[PDB]
Design a protein around this nucleic acid. Sequence first.
DNA 1: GACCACGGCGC
DNA 2: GGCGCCGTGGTC
Length: 515
Amino acid sequence: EAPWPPPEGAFVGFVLSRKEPMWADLLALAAARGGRVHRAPEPYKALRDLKEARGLLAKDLSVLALREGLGLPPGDDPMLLAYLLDPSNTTPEGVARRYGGEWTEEAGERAALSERLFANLWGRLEGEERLLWLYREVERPLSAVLAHVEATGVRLDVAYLRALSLEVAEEIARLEAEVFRLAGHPFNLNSRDQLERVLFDELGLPAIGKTEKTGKRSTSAAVLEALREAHAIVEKILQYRELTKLKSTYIDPLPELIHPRTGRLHTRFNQTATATGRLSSSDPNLQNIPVRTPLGQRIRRAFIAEEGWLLVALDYSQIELRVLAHLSGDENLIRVFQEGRDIHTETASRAAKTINFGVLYGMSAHRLSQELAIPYIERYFQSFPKVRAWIEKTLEEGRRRGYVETLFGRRRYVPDLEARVKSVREAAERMAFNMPVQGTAADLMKLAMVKLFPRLEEMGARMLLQVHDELVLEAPKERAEAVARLAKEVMEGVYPLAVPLEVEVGIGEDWLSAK
DNA sequence: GACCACGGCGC
DNA sequence: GGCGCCGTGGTC
């Protein structure tokens, strides 16, 4: 042990009062180097001494620093190394338990664990040049970008949501009142246990589906959809469920999450959470804001730009299919994207839509038989033979090596590619050949975020949200159209493929208007 | 108060 | 056919 401050390039360790760095109280700050732990007397002011957040969960501490007006960029993170070695490595505890060490609740030990786990996992990346490139060029600099993004937050029209809440509440009460009549008695409509008995035991409706673990008569939307005219209560329940779903998840909780220092809504972009290399948003989740239903579109208008600013929404156009074309090298599918006609009138030479989106997931003919209503695909695979050839090629290589790769080299280990149970094996297969498609699209989006962000700062623009294949920026009205033009070009040319990457742009005062 | 499994559902 | 969060129900 040595007294604060630590020397240059030391690994950091810290303890928060809660997982959300924007709401966290920094309880303890420490730093280790050469096995020598430096503990801070007072954590908050000791942040001024550090010049780079370097260690486990570095981005989180960086977000807290940005919250306190301190410029503390995140550098190395053993979590990012482990994630590239294996996407199943998602948490410091799991990483420590796998590669040695104990993840505890003391800042000094965490700083020591960070230095060690790094040297361990860094030595494992020796010779892994494609994994090292992803670290230096994508993941490590992206953490610095996501730090600024999380600390920036998005402006939210709270008053509009408070108003919308009262409006939805009355339609919910109206629907709940009618369900009670048709049932002949009141009951908890939010309780699926109670709803099952009313529909299937009391009113005697055909119970079709059944729950997985416990085996109960399912009352899901899919099951109820077939009963939506068998009785009016089924129609009223599904309407009721949509409103309660949106109100209890978005309309009510979100206005309670406005930060007192920024006055904006702050989310967390988890960098090591998915098995494909995708990002995930939590606390709250802003990657699943409603947009489908009419009421959902109303909720999205609550997400507004600052006064004197505009939102810039950039969406990739079928990036996965374009990736699939590049990975397969299918001459026919490439020609469809290359010429620039409607991608689906051309792959028809609605039936063409569903499998052109479903082939990425391994959509069987069973669901297509139900979706398009024809009785019980092969026509598609003969139009694009290399696509089928690529799937078989990926699965074959997946069984040998034990993992599948993205374009840049991001790997996911699929163990059940040789299971003796067909349902298990074919399930793992669908996970196996989807990862290179979803992972590459994730790699492209990530790399696009890395290249674009410093261009935003130099133009006085902001990066607010990422929705897998979508970006939401914030730029002053003056620079708004210039930012949209530069951002569009950074995203489309992030990494030149055998097919061009298309991006649609949109500018507005809110998320709904811009998109 | 806290915790979690489950079903159901938003993207 | 990759995610996070809701209320319910149960437990501590």
